[PDB]
Amino acid sequence: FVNQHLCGSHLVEALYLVCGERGFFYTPKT
Amino acid sequence: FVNQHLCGSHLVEALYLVCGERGFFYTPKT
Amino acid sequence: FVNQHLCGSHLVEALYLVCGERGFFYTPKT
Amino acid sequence: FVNQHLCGSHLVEALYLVCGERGFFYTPKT
Amino acid sequence: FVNQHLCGSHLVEALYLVCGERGFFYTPKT
Amino acid sequence: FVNQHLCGSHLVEALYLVCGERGFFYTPKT
Amino acid sequence: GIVEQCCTSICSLYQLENYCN
Amino acid sequence: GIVEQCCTSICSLYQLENYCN
Amino acid sequence: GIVEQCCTSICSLYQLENYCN
Amino acid sequence: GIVEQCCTSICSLYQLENYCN
Amino acid sequence: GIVEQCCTSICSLYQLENYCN
Amino acid sequence: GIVEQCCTSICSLYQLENYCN
Numbered sequence: 001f002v003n004q005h006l007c008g009s010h011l012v013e014a015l016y017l018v019c020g021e022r023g024f025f026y027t028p029k030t
Numbered sequence: 031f032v033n034q035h036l037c038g039s040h041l042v043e044a045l046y047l048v049c050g051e052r053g054f055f056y057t058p059k060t
Numbered sequence: 061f062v063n064q065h066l067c068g069s070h071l072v073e074a075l076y077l078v079c080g081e082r083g084f085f086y087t088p089k090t
Numbered sequence: 091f092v093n094q095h096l097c098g099s100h101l102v103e104a105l106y107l108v109c110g111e112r113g114f115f116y117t118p119k120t
Numbered sequence: 121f122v123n124q125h126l127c128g129s130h131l132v133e134a135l136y137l138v139c140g141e142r143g144f145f146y147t148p149k150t
Numbered sequence: 151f152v153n154q155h156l157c158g159s160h161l162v163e164a165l166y167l168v169c170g171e172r173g174f175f176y177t178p179k180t
Numbered sequence: 181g182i183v184e185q186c187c188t189s190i191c192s193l194y195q196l197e198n199y200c201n
Numbered sequence: 202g203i204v205e206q207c208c209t210s211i212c213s214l215y216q217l218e219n220y221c222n
Numbered sequence: 223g224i225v226e227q228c229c230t231s232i233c234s235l236y237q238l239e240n241y242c243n
Numbered sequence: 244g245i246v247e248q249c250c251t252s253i254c255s256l257y258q259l260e261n262y263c264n
Numbered sequence: 265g266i267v268e269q270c271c272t273s274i275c276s277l278y279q280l281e282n283y284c285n
Numbered sequence: 286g287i288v289e290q291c292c293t294s295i296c297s298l299y300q301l302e303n304y305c306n
């Protein structure tokens with residue numbers, strides 16, 4: 001696959017894609 | 031605000047907008 | 061809730077979310 | 091251009107692309 | 121219609137919109 | 151990665167994320 | 181209306197253009 | 202859960218807020 | 223306008239309701 | 244094809260990768 | 265390419281059709 | 286964090302799996 005900049009809603013879209021059913025956490029403060 | 035009918039990635043989008051810098055967790059059943 | 065930068069299609073997505081059934085106007089010229 | 095089958099936020103997206111700087115109004119039934 | 125900056129996933133969304141059934145190629149290297 | 155159920159523009163989005171700088175072709179039946 | 185037509189049937193960018201400002 | 206409820210029924214931004222961090 | 227309010231600056235979801243019909 | 248399979252059934256990112264350039 | 269035409273510069277919907285199959 | 290890894294810098298799909306549950 002590739003490496004792109006994934007920001008904002010696009011990041012969370014990517015997480016949704018990658019993780020799907022497993023779910024994910026989006027935690028920008030870290 | 032109005033009630034929402036949100037499937038798939040649209041939910042993750044809505045969560046992203048609602049939570050912002052707080053982030054969120056996406057936890058589907060599975 | 062939060063305050064983020066919402067631009068472009070992301071703005072109109074947010075408007076769709078917030079307003080839904082009521083509808084909205086997206087009028088960038090003002 | 092082709093004919094479009096556009097529900098929910100996909101319509102608002104299509105309106106955004108089609109209208110650009112003109113903006114648009116989203117007016118559902120409801 | 122209009123002319124906007126269409127980048128990234130937004131470009132490919134626009135291509136999907138314009139082309140639909142015909143399909144398209146997204147080939148950033150050129 | 152998980153299996154994906156992707157219709158319409160969501161497929162083009164997934165292709166965009168998966169392919170990145172390589173780009174892709176979207177070729178529906180038709 | 182346009183919202184219902186695009187979703188339940190199909191619609192054109194040309195029809196969508198009528199909703200521009 | 203919230204994912205299933207928003208999709209099969211409806212949900213509110215106020216319900217969605219409970220999933221913020 | 224909305225773009226200055228929400229894109230240039232930041233705006234809340236509540237502010238975004240200003241642009242509902 | 245991949246477009247129909249992903250939508251009517253399921254598909255993998257690994258299958259989607261075959262459509263990269 | 266499309267990115268220079270449409271992202272770097274601006275392009276119309278009509279120009280975007282150049283990239284249909 | 287994910288934002289530094291994936292937005293500020295670049296990250297792979299594999300790296301994005303770090304943030305699955």
Ligand SMILES: [Cl-]
Nearest residue numbers: 008010070130
């Ligand atoms: Cl963006």
Ligand SMILES: [Cl-]
Nearest residue numbers: 037038098158
């Ligand atoms: Cl959908």
Ligand SMILES: [Zn+2]
Nearest residue numbers: 009010070130
């Ligand atoms: Zn974007």
Ligand SMILES: [Zn+2]
Nearest residue numbers: 040100158160
């Ligand atoms: Zn969708």
